[PDB]
Amino acid sequence: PPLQAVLVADSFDRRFFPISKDQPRVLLPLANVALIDYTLEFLTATGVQETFVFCCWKAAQIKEHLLKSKWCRPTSLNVVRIITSELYRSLGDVLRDVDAKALVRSDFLLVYGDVISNINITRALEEHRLRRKLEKNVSVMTMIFKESSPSHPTRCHEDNVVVAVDSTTNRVLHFQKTQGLRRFAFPLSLFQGSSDGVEVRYDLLDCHISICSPQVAQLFTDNFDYQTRDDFVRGLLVNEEILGNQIHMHVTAKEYGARVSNLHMYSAVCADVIRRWVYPLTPEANFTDSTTQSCTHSRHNIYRGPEVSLGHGSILEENVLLGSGTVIGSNCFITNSVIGPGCHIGDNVVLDQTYLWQGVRVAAGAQIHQSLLCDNAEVKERVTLKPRSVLTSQVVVGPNITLPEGSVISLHPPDAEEDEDDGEFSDIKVFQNEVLGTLQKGKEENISCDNLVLEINSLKYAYNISLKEVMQVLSHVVLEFPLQQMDSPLDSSRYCALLLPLLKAWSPVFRNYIKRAADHLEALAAIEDFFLEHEALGISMAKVLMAFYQLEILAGETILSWFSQRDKGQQLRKNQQLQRFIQWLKEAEE
Amino acid sequence: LTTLDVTKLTPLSHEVISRQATINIGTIGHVAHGKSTVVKAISGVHTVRFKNELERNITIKLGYANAKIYKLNFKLVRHVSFVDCPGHDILMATMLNGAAVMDAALLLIAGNESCPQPQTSEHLAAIEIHILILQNKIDLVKESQAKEQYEQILAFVQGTVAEGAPIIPLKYNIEVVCEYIVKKIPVPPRDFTSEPRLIVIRSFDVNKPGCEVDDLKGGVAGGSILKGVLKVGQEIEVRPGIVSKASEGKLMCKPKFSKIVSLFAEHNDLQYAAPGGLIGVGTKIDPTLCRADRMVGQVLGAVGALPEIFTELEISYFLLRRLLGVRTEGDKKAAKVQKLSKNEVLMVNIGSLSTGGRVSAVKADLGKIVLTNPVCTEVGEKIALSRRVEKHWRLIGWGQIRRGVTIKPT
Numbered sequence A: 001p002p003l004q005a006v007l008v009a010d011s012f013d014r015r016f017f018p019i020s021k022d023q024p025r026v027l028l029p030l031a032n033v034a035l036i037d038y039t040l041e042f043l044t045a046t047g048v049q050e051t052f053v054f055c056c057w058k059a060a061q062i063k064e065h066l067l068k069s070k071w072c073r074p075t076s077l078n079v080v081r082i083i084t085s086e087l088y089r090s091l092g093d094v095l096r097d098v099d100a101k102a103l104v105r106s107d108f109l110l111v112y113g114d115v116i117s118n119i120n121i122t123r124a125l126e127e128h129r130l131r132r133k134l135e136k137n138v139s140v141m142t143m144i145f146k147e148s149s150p151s152h153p154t155r156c157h158e159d160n161v162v163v164a165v166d167s168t169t170n171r172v173l174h175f176q177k178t179q180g181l182r183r184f185a186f187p188l189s190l191f192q193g194s195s196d197g198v199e200v201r202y203d204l205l206d207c208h209i210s211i212c213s214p215q216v217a218q219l220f221t222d223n224f225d226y227q228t229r230d231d232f233v234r235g236l237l238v239n240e241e242i243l244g245n246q247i248h249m250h251v252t253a254k255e256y257g258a259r260v261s262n263l264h265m266y267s268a269v270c271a272d273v274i275r276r277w278v279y280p281l282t283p284e285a286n287f288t289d290s291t292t293q294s295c296t297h298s299r300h301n302i303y304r305g306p307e308v309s310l311g312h313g314s315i316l317e318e319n320v321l322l323g324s325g326t327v328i329g330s331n332c333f334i335t336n337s338v339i340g341p342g343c344h345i346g347d348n349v350v351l352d353q354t355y356l357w358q359g360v361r362v363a364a365g366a367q368i369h370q371s372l373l374c375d376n377a378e379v380k381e382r383v384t385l386k387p388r389s390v391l392t393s394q395v396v397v398g399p400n401i402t403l404p405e406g407s408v409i410s411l412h413p414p415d416a417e418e419d420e421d422d423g424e425f426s427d428i429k430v431f432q433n434e435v436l437g438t439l440q441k442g443k444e445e446n447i448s449c450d451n452l453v454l455e456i457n458s459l460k461y462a463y464n465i466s467l468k469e470v471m472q473v474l475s476h477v478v479l480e481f482p483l484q485q486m487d488s489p490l491d492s493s494r495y496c497a498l499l500l501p502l503l504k505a506w507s508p509v510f511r512n513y514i515k516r517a518a519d520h521l522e523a524l525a526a527i528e529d530f531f532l533e534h535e536a537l538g539i540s541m542a543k544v545l546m547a548f549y550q551l552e553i554l555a556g557e558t559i560l561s562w563f564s565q566r567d568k569g570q571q572l573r574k575n576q577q578l579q580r581f582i583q584w585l586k587e588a589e590e
Numbered sequence B: 001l002t003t004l005d006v007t008k009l010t011p012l013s014h015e016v017i018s019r020q021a022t023i024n025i026g027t028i029g030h031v032a033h034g035k036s037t038v039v040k041a042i043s044g045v046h047t048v049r050f051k052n053e054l055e056r057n058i059t060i061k062l063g064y065a066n067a068k069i070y071k072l073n074f075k076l077v078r079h080v081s082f083v084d085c086p087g088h089d090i091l092m093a094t095m096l097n098g099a100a101v102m103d104a105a106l107l108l109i110a111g112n113e114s115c116p117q118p119q120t121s122e123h124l125a126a127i128e129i130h131i132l133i134l135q136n137k138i139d140l141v142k143e144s145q146a147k148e149q150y151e152q153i154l155a156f157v158q159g160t161v162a163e164g165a166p167i168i169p170l171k172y173n174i175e176v177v178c179e180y181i182v183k184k185i186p187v188p189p190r191d192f193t194s195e196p197r198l199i200v201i202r203s204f205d206v207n208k209p210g211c212e213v214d215d216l217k218g219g220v221a222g223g224s225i226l227k228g229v230l231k232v233g234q235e236i237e238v239r240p241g242i243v244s245k246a247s248e249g250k251l252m253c254k255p256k257f258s259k260i261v262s263l264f265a266e267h268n269d270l271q272y273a274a275p276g277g278l279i280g281v282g283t284k285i286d287p288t289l290c291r292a293d294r295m296v297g298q299v300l301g302a303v304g305a306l307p308e309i310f311t312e313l314e315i316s317y318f319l320l321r322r323l324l325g326v327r328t329e330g331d332k333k334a335a336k337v338q339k340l341s342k343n344e345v346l347m348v349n350i351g352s353l354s355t356g357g358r359v360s361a362v363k364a365d366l367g368k369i370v371l372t373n374p375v376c377t378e379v380g381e382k383i384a385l386s387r388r389v390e391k392h393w394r395l396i397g398w399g400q401i402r403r404g405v406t407i408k409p410t
Helices: A035-046 A061-066 A093-099 A123-136 A189-193 A215-220 A229-238 A261-275 A428-444 A451-465 A465-484 A490-505 A508-514 A517-533 A535-548 A556-564 A569-571 A576-589 B033-042 B088-094 B117-128 B142-162 B171-184
Strands: A004-008 A051-054 A082-084 A110-112 A114-118 A141-148 A161-165 A171-176 A198-199 A204-206 A247-252 A257-259 A321-324 A331-335 A350-352 A367-369 A369-375 A390-392 A406-408 B023-027 B065-072 B075-084 B105-109 B131-135 B198-204 B220-225 B235-238 B242-244 B253-254 B255-263 B278-283 B300-301 B311-315 B345-350 B353-363 B368-374 B382-388 B393-407
Touching: A004 A035, A035 A061, A035 A114, A051 A061, A051 A093, A061 A082, A061 A141, A093 A215, A093 A406, A114 A261, A114 A428, A123 A141, A123 B131, A141 A257, A161 A204, A161 A331, A171 A229, A171 A247, A171 B033, A204 A257, A215 A229, A229 A247, A257 A261, A321 A490, A367 A369, A369 B353, A406 B131, A428 A451, A451 A465, A451 A508, A451 B117, A451 B142, A465 A490, A465 A508, A465 A517, A465 B142, A490 A508, A490 A535, A517 A535, A517 A556, A517 A569, A535 A569, A556 A576, A556 B105, B023 B033, B023 B088, B033 B065, B033 B075, B033 B171, B065 B171, B088 B117, B088 B345, B088 B353, B088 B382, B088 B393, B117 B142, B198 B278, B235 B393, B242 B255, B345 B368, B345 B393
Parallel strands: A004 A051, A004 A110, A051 A082, A141 A247, A331 A350, A350 A367, A369 A390, A390 A406, B023 B075, B023 B105, B105 B131
Antiparallel strands: A114 A257, A141 A204, A161 A171, A161 A198, B065 B075, B198 B220, B198 B300, B220 B278, B235 B255, B235 B300, B242 B253, B255 B278, B311 B368, B311 B393, B345 B353, B345 B382, B353 B368, B382 B393
């Protein structure tokens, strides 16, 4: 069987800003070579036969970058399939377009477009194939990790991954990240599901070369909520009672594999490529066929291109790469840095862990430490730079202007920190509260009567209260809403004005709640208790009695039975306003 | 054996000449994988077996089980297709999305306790709609079942305050429940004169591995008929069709027309096919175009259905405040449906078509959801909107489709 692979050449995280606003993050040079060429060289060193490159943002630039490469030649053993569409914006969307196109056949590879690796995974591929052959397509994904230390500068705190796997058959049981977590919690069902062996691993750097079955594309077409890889694994590990699909794991201890996510991963992977940690993928080896990147390797990992014309007094002590045509002046001191092709360096300059790309121009007396200089840049004289300073796409830094530690300059104002120029200067209680909140939401959002009645029925089914108790709670909420409409007026006019439109709008829910004569008597008793609790607006207590007979809430016979039934409530109902309302109801009835 | 034929002009829902699929009956209760055993005890364990494959969408698809309820060498008049869905929220979203769905709701309640699963089932039955309460906790004590029947009678009093007037408290109780369902549930009115619309729910492949070159059957799809009558030999009309994005832009949906070669149900069905059951149609389609659950979500029309393939649908955003009857003892902001945020996935269940879509834009009563796959139901149908709360797709709201971006390639 052939070995297929998919390559997500568009990282959908907004991390390389505003670096990815000009050229994408898969076209940035580590050491004069884009990460697309590194990942494709890793794929041909693996032994794949056909790839599927997926790129959405600036995909024409990626296409014109990789068509002139070694992998688009007809003599290449590993062909590529450029697929261009601006519709997808997620890795799950990429995999569901793979499922809709039906490109892969069996056991295809999954890789991002910014993964630097040299691992031969034929052993892991045969392990995944035998695990699929014995257990009858139960194993679906084989994640790959590298043995690393938690204190290593490669893995940062934003991308640290802690897993909990099995010891004898290396299947993954738990998988999470440490993004702002001082204490980690692991589930308890992993021990009951596997009583043979379990091990928690924090020494695993993620390389995102997780080979997998074509069933992950089916699972991505089923679950549309799975956006990327990690939430897909976190949802597959918790949904084990249905569609089990155990994920296995492979570890690498003698080969290198990582990716980039920010400036820290970029700096660490660049320092590892310069220090030959990803051998055979080496800058002087020239794995891609290009005359502008041919190099030679001296001692102390010094990489020298053609036509440098090095000056007197310049010191290159450790981990220095020089591009083709890079002009270097006198009395320089370069260490742990990569320089692009066609650059111009001044005099009495220091370069400490910097990353200079093609076309830059550094004047004399400049102090640059741990920075990143992008294409066609210009740097004037008498300037001191601090660590973690980024300048993208021809940013000129004026003389006698030092930058702070956190400082990113570009041509876009709101994405970067600034823009530069030739000058750098510019029980029943909870149910009652839920019913009151539902009534407040229906009054604020102007909900209909049917949805309000459905929400009231859902709250009555959830609280499991009786019908008369739910009617009394609804009457208490309707009496408390007009009592909460006024803060401390202590008057009947504002309470009547708040209770008239509330009873006029919510008349259908009050008719659906209070329907029988016993429900009408319970509503009359709740109205009497609310008038006893709100006696300061008691002059409106008859005004509600003329309202419930007007909106067909309380009938005239029920009102007569409530007035005839007697105490404090009988003395409150024997007022002049209640007697006048009863006389008006008897005159209007007949 | 049956004695059906291809000579029919205007059939009825209670016609005894077909005896394959007369009426449908929904089942939503507090089963927790207990309703399949009740459907096997009522109809049959290995009765529904036509074409099996790998379970792709278990919680999203609903299974239909036919039952020929006979009476008196017995005589069969009408058959009931019990629709069992994994999770009551999917069945509720399928029922509250139009008409002619879940005509006879069966409330499979438990006589053990009064937990919140029966309250959520009663809320789903109230949001869907003829109820049919049935206690499954057999083999109990006399006074214990009497107290459980008193608690179920209080729950049924609250039900009768909403919609609650069935009465039913191992084979004899199942036969009594079948007789009560045959005597109580009336025949629902179905439109047979309209065009046949077969919404696919589960597609299968009838071609075995290593088959002959001449004996090759492809495109044995299966779904549910909304309205009309489907006969063998009629040219079907796949409304979604093949959706291809090979033009480097908007995907074109080419409708693939295939003549219906046979209508193969769970039993030996005839040429004519009516609604209210798991209708399986084997047409003259390719095996690659109709793979295992690949042609799902496609409206297999018959006379050129008006519903076009919509990519972005602007509907009326109307979400509920809390969950329908789902509230535990804690309830620490669990039953609280949030607002429609930007770039959020939602499972719009337009009838039987459950398609995922991202919330591209929302203005205060109008949400424009961009669907992943092309859907073709109607221009103003009642579309639901669900959201996965905790590893389970639960309904969050409903709405009406106000506008849509249609596309029809050829």
